[PDB]
Ligand binder design. Structure first.
Ligand code: RXP
Ligand code: CPS
Ligand code: CPS
Ligand code: CA
Ligand code: ZN
Ligand code: ZN
Length: 162
């Protein structure tokens, strides 16, 4: 598909690249998680996601600590867990996870990668925060399973996309 957007015919098939991985998780698990977090959005939008292993993609994902050259320094364990921003000098969506967190998957004790990632991909796609507590786009993280769009989340997507 081609979808008319912003007055222009844009492409819906997109690429993303994982630049570095968190140390507490094995690569394959981080890969499946990132894909699964992107899929919660692709299910309710005209977008598709493909993983690339070189060059620049539409979505660049990285795990960094503190200062990593973007004026959004991370703050070590806790606090901010990640963020996503649009660099002016590159046509891409940048998402960085704070390497200092105890990254986990499916464990209510650690910091869930599936949730933080789904949240960041939400930004990349245009959504902003909401006050709904159990919303994927809430400003605050609380372990919540399964990963699912709340009504406020579907409305948000329906507002930005058809
Ligand atoms: N652990 C959290 O919940 C925190 C918020 C928080 C709670 N206690 C704190 C003590 C000190 C500092 C921050 C916090 N959220 C995050 O880390 C957020 C990402 C994960 C949330 C998520 C995951 C799963 C389900 C639901 C929610 C960070 P962010 O929201 O993506 C990011 C947005 C942003 C992107 C690009 C540019 C600016 C801002 N925020 C953030 O606040 O970044 C820096 C900043 C700090 C204060 C004001 C403006 C900007
Ligand atoms: C195809 C759809 C509209 C329908 C439009 C709506 C918002 C658009 C994205 C964001 O803008 C962030 C980022 C900016 C980069 O520049 C290019 C990559 C990326 C992911 C954009 C891609 C694509 O363009 C989008 C998904
Ligand atoms: C860091 C603190 C919590 C501690 C949290 C509490 C409310 C959050 C803000 C608002 O939500 C509005 C807005 C939504 C956008 O989507 C992204 C930007 C912005 C400014 C958010 C940023 C940051 O996340 C905040 C300040
Ligand atoms: Ca942190
Ligand atoms: Zn960063
Ligand atoms: Zn956020």
């Amino acid at each position: 598909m081609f979808v008319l957007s912003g007055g222009r015919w844009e492409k819906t098939d997109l690429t993303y690249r994982i630049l570095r991985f968190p140390w507490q998780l094995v690569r394959e698990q981080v890969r499946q998680t990132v894909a699964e977090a992107l899929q919660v959005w692709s299910e309710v939008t005209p977008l598709t996601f493909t993983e690339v292993h070189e060059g620049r993609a539409d979505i660049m994902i990285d795990f960094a600590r503190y200062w990593h050259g973007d004026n959004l320094p991370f703050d070590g364990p806790g606090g901010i867990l990640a963020h996503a921003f649009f660099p002016k000098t590159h046509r891409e969506g940048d998402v960085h996870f704070d390497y200092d967190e105890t990254w986990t998957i499916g464990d209510n004790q650690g910091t869930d990668l599936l949730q933080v990632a789904a949240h960041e991909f939400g930004h990349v796609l245009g959504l902003q925060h909401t006050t709904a507590a159990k919303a994927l786009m809430s400003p605050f993280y609380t372990f919540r399973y399964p990963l699912s769009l709340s009504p406020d989340d579907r409305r948000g997507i329906q507002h930005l996309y058809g």
